[PDB]
Design a protein around this ligand. Structure first.
Ligand SMILES: CCCCC[C@H](CC(=O)NO)C(=O)N[C@H](C(=O)N1CCC[C@H]1CO)C(C)C
Ligand SMILES: CCCCC[C@H](CC(=O)NO)C(=O)N[C@H](C(=O)N1CCC[C@H]1CO)C(C)C
Ligand SMILES: CCCCC[C@H](CC(=O)NO)C(=O)N[C@H](C(=O)N1CCC[C@H]1CO)C(C)C
Ligand SMILES: [Mn+2]
Ligand SMILES: [Mn+2]
Ligand SMILES: [Mn+2]
Ligand SMILES: [Mn+2]
Ligand SMILES: [Mn+2]
Ligand SMILES: [Mn+2]
Lengths: 519, 519, 515
């Protein structure tokens, strides 16, 4: 039994995540010119675009423009912002001055990046919002790109985060009182509906909120309750295998990892079937390690800092699934959340233990901190073998390896994929969404020998360290796919793209939405 | 309460160890020539001996010999094998070809080694069995050494291990389906009976099985049940002091170490008295740390890999005892198993705790990972003071220190002994059995000062590292001997000889059998 | 400087590398059946192929086949070998028995690998040669693949290495007396395959050799020896000349060492109209001790391999000349020892690169990119022509092994077309490759420096390390250059547990072959 006060706090936090709606609205120049009549929404306005786009004639005719803003556009450095004051410009707050902030987006974009450069867009708007005069206002963000999806996510992930514990916000279920309503204004009427872009943005910021939150708030239990809350709200099926049931029912992997912890591990599977004929049957699986302490292979304090992020794969596939339901994307989805805390205690699984996986294959544990692949190997077997349908495509997302960062870096998720066509599709989706990706070596013939075990079918870690580590971890997961399954397997290592110096990025959901969108 | 499924698995595993019988039979050339009539047992046959022995005239007259095998004997490198095919040679499996594998054993053997070189014999047979055409067959291993005991153990420890979790053998109580019946064929009828050699081989492979097994199968509890199972089977007395009873009854050492763990520590004492007059009264004590995680002095993951082996001393004295009973060796034995898990948790004994040992002397714990000597100090006090007799000789066996490997290495167990005569005897037994040993410095005057404590009688670790570490650990154990005891004390550090790159070696039992045999 | 005895030894070693010719010959079943008349070349014979290929009818009709070999083919495990004795089979050595060794090659091959699986082929033949009855014989290796180039290199890199110091071979200029003549028998010209094989084994020999034999000086003398032999131009900028002439990078790195650093540029122009103008640049760190950022002893073990990029581009160039490939080639070897001493470049020093840009040294052990940045500027700016393609090869980063592994070299490439071409060449040659992220917009910020143009190392460690090192090199390209840049990180593929692999030369030969 938890203390009564802590249960009150946790309940409040669950509700805050279930009832979270975004702070971002979307419109266009013409529709703004009619709805607002040229009156600005508050004492701040932001303008963002490429060097050439800021010098387009249409910019002059915007309602905040004046000879100062024109100079600001001259003076601004690429990648940076320039602010100016304008006196007596008509505005809803009645402020004698209005602050205009220009920001220049670069046009340079390599073949493996999103040509819109939403990464910079996010930074520019974050900078501009740092000079905010009053909180709980509405800030007009005029963008000059028409790439609506990437920008929508880029602005959603920007500025101050919706999760906060500062200045007594712990008393208000950790909802930031410092967030500004943001009204994005595209040149054209969008391409995608405003009500749709708002969903994508909500999913990005919910993913962000979950990831950000500390493990004393977001436990295996509260994450499950949140999924349940959304299941009741949007009307989809939820299946939960909790604690010792996992051992009874053959799920040795997720059980062994999570059994040490105070809050029991759970395999939470969600289900959505669209009205009409689905274009593809897709199964999602997320690594949901709510805190990776390392187990008995205890991490040193420096590497254990920010391990609340180890749930980031689960939060991605979850919020990606929530968008699909809300928009009624015509994809038949399973979403399986592998929830556990890799904890240290009397009941820790051990460096030498042998696990009997739900696949039936045995795993010699060399290192308890390689927990992610074990928990996923049960997740992917569940999806390919225990569900009411066989998927065409399996997508597993996880904050799996440090090797990821060394190979593909902080902005690109690593792809271990068994088919060129599906790799290409997910890659394309990265470029379109702005939540980019890149391939790591697919070569099972060289990965398998690294897992030779004396007494088990396989180990959970490479014999040798410097031999395609992002890939070998991916291979391990594939060995626990059902032999029923013949289709396409996409493993997504997103260890670093989930976070930056300001906290979580909400990376994952938008990438999925865009991948689904083009099947 | 464990999960129902895990209890079923554990029970199955207990039974598999209790009812384990060997896969090795033994006979001689003449007896084989008459029983088999020159028909080979399967599509594989192995021939092993020294350079001179392979060129003895008697080899030609063997039933698999031909002009190819004669060339194989020329071509073979010392320490290696050479395989050849022979067409239409009569055999029980009806295979068109029979594979003959020659292996050359070296004759070089230093004063501290076994002149037969069973180490190489084990390797040669392991190599030959790697080309096995069908599992569950019978392979004829023709050896040309008459040193029957060392060869018997050497073949028992060789090839694929009886413990296995591969290819669904987890469903069959972890019994390997991949093992070959091995029929050893000596030149002469063996100096020891075949029914006796089979026991020695069974003990070696049981020891092997226990050590190999992961700590999730072999717990303090299941090990105790195994001892009990054998006690009911062979009719000897078993005494168990479990969990908190240890604290109540003054056993502070073994209690403190093991109390953190999920499964409680146990001091299991076994007793055997032969029908007539015993030649000697011997007390065995084994370090039975089922997993050494280090305690609060938590081991780094690399050094914690393979710590399921830390029980290896207990498994040695246990299986050594089982052989004595089964062969009815005329030795009066006590066998005390010091079973605990050095675990990490809320209830861990601490680096600064003071233990009150069963000896009555107080121990300041400097480092919780030096758990072995504490546990043994209670074990040896129990044997020298609480039993129905006072032993003439105390033998304690343990996987005690890393220092062992630095000093005596992977093949020789370290001996800390208080009397030259007993050191000599155990050394002799090493050379005869092939489970070899070597002395480490005995010099208590220089060991004692390393354990000076401010507030306790002693510490559990040296002030200075690099002052006869194998020995100092031995000394600690001697301080907890009863003052009643005045006989011979043999401390056996077998940290490395218990294992190799293939897993456990079953080192210990045969050394004991041979030591007992020559009192 | 040196003792008279050591100079004698070094000279002998130089000559051994210059006059090295391969031990491998190539032929086919029909041509062997006619030349040899069915008499085997020695008391050993080897048979290598896939599960289905070993069961093809044509195998039966081979001159060593018998009912035992047929069982050996049954008994063999995939990836392993099985040996058998055959009595009185006709053979050149007159041995009462002949040993036949079968080896089974797998057919499983992922999209990023060579379908022939020459990796396994190499292992199989190495295993079979371990049971050799007499050295200095000729062993008949019957292969059942027709993928001639990858197999030729695979057999060249296999078995006992030509460099050896065992059993007094130090007295015979470190030439192994334990090597077998290998006659490969298939079911490209033989004189051409022999060159590719010679290049693979020369690359191997250079890499294997210890840094007390292969110094910056002896490597340069070897290049000179080959320049005199095959008639091509050689340009050498030695020691302090590098400082005088603006080459701050390669000078600073190598100036601490006993033997001075050298920028050795080689030149070849084919008789007709070249299909492309290509400039090669190799990291030639003869020993990477780390400099003042001294490596720990474990990571400094096997750092004689840090020259492996140079040995690749050098031997790749030698093949091009010998076969007269119609490519106009520059080959620039960046030779230095990253040494520790009174004159070590320092962690805080600022280098003035030949490019003109300034480099703040954060860590002296990131020596490779500095040395290469001068190499690629030399090629793109100081030569008699402007290349269409720049290929730089180096044993550059440990990150490589984490990202692409032991069998695939990492590719940082600025154009999809050239990446594709080099990738294809990998799959064909068997010296495989794989891409690492190309994204300069994210790499550049990692090199921000307070007082210099750039640093030589990332601010942050976990951010596409194989790629960032590549980017550094691109900043020192000439602005004259607008063509295709291929950076090849081959840190791990150059070696395995048996020593050097001779990885690089065959990959180039095959890339050139199709341009
Ligand atoms: C020993 C295996 C531990 C598991 C892999 C972990 C990640 C993890 O625990 N996921 O649950 C990791 O990032 N490991 C890194 C790591 O082991 N590698 C792989 C090779 C070098 C280095 C990369 O940083 C470092 C940061 C600890
Ligand atoms: C403080 C630990 C005291 C117990 C010695 C332990 C062995 C142990 O845990 N036994 O249960 C050990 O690991 N010994 C080694 C060790 O601590 N030493 C002492 C100096 C070098 C080395 C000797 O092997 C390690 C490094 C493998
Ligand atoms: C810090 C500067 C390191 C310089 C580059 C070296 C390799 C080198 O010196 N080549 O000359 C490297 O990557 N070394 C590795 C290394 O430092 N890294 C970088 C990140 C983690 C780890 C392995 O990639 C290991 C092998 C020691
Ligand atoms: Mn993790
Ligand atoms: Mn982990
Ligand atoms: Mn221990
Ligand atoms: Mn210990
Ligand atoms: Mn280097
Ligand atoms: Mn270096």
């Amino acid at each position: 039994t938890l203390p009564k006060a802590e249960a009150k706090e946790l309940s409040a936090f669950v509700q805050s995540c279930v009832e979270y709606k975004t702070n971002v609205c979307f419109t266009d120049v013409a529709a703004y010119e009619s709805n607002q009549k040229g009156v600005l929404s508050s004492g701040l306005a932001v303008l963002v675009g490429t060097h050439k786009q800021l010098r387009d004639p249409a910019v002059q005719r915007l309602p905040f423009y004046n000879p100062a803003v024109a100079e600001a556009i001259e003076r601004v450095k690429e990648g940076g912002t320039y602010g100016v004051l304008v006196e007596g410009l008509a505005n809803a707050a009645g402020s004698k001055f209005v602050r205009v902030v220009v920001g220049e987006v670069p046009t340079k974009a390599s073949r493996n990046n999103c040509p819109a450069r939403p990464d910079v867009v996010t930074x520019l708007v974050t900078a501009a919002l740092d000079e905010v005069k009053e909180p709980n206002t509405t800030v007009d963000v005029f963008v000059l790109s028409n790439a609506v999806l990437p920008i929508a996510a880029a602005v959603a992930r920007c500025g101050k985060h919706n999760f906060s514990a500062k200045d007594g916000a712990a008393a208000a279920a950790y909802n930031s009182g410092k967030v500004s309503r943001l009204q994005v204004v595209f040149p054209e009427p969008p391409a995608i509906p405003p009500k749709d872009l708002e969903a994508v943005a909500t999913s990005t910021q919910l993913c962000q909120r979950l990831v950000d939150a500390p493990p004393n708030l977001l436990t295996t239990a509260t994450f499950t309750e949140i999924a349940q809350g959304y299941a009741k709200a949007l009307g989809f099926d939820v299946d939960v295998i909790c604690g010792d049931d996992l051992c009874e029912r053959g799920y040795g992997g997720i059980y062994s990892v999570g059994k040490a912890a105070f809050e029991a591990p759970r395999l939470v599977t969600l289900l959505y079937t669209p009205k009409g004929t689905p274009v593809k049957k897709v199964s999602l699986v997320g690594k949901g390690i709510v805190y990776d302490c390392g187990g008995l292979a205890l991490k040193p304090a420096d590497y254990m800092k920010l391990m609340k992020h180890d749930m980031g794969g689960a939060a991605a596939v979850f919020c990606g699934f929530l968008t699909a339901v809300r928009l009624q994307q015509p994809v038949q989805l399973s979403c399986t959340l592998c929830l556990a805390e890799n904890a240290i205690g009397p009941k820790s699984y051990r460096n030498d233990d042998i696990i009997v996986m739900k696949s039936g294959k045995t795993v010699e544990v060399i290192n308890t901190d390689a927990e992610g692949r074990i928990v996923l190997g049960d997740g992917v077997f569940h999806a390919t073998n225990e569900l009411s349908f066989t998927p065409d495509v399996v997508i597993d997302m996880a904050t799996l390896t440090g090797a990821q960062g060394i190979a593909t870096g902080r902005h690109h998720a690593g792809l271990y994929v068994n088919e060129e066509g599906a790799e290409a599709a997910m890659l394309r989706a990265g470029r379109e969404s702005g939540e980019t990706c890149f391939p790591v070596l697919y070569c099972p013939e060289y990965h398998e020998p690294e897992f030779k075990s004396n007494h088990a079918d396989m180990t959970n870690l490479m014999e040798r360290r410097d031999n395609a580590g992002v890939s070998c971890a991916g291979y391990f997961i594939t060995t626990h796919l059902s032999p029923k399954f013949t289709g396409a397997h996409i493993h997504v290592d997103l260890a670093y793209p989930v976070f930056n110096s300001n906290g979580a990025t909400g990376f994952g959901p938008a990438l999925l939405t865009e991948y689904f969108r083009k099947l």
